[PDB]
């Protein structure tokens, strides 16, 4: 397992998915910029790090 940074619990094989590079629950897609927790992989991905599509388009 590898630990989910948003919710604080360890993600085993629950809602475990890779977005950019890091393990994520599909509720817990925490943004590197603004920190808004997002849905599945629908947003913008950078190298091993995620950023919202809306917040990164603004920034
Ligand atoms: Zn989580
Ligand atoms: Zn964001």
């Amino acid at each position: 397992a590898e630990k989910c940074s948003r919710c604080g619990d360890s993600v085993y094989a629950a809602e475990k998915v890779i977005g950019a590079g890091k393990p994520w629950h599909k509720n817990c897609f925490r943004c590197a910029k603004c920190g808004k927790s997002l849905e599945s992989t629908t947003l913008t991905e950078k190298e091993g790090e995620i950023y919202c599509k809306g917040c990164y388009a603004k920034n």
Side-chain angles (χ1 to χ4, degrees):
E2 204 287 303
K3 206 186 279 72
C4 182
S5 57
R6 172 72 289 181
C7 59
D9 301 296
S10 188
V11 59
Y12 293 92
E15 300 178 64
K16 200 169 182 179
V17 290
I18 301 299
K22 300 193 297 300
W24 298 121
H25 292 118
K26 293 184 289 296
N27 187 65
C28 295
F29 267 63
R30 191 183 66 194
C31 173
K33 180 64 174 63
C34 76
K36 182 180 176 181
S37 55
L38 308 162
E39 51 180 65
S40 58
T41 311
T42 52
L43 46 136
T44 52
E45 282 65 62
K46 301 299 296 184
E47 188 178 297
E49 191 167 297
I50 57 174
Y51 282 81
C52 313
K53 45 182 171 296
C55 82
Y56 197 61
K58 181 62 176 63
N59 185 246

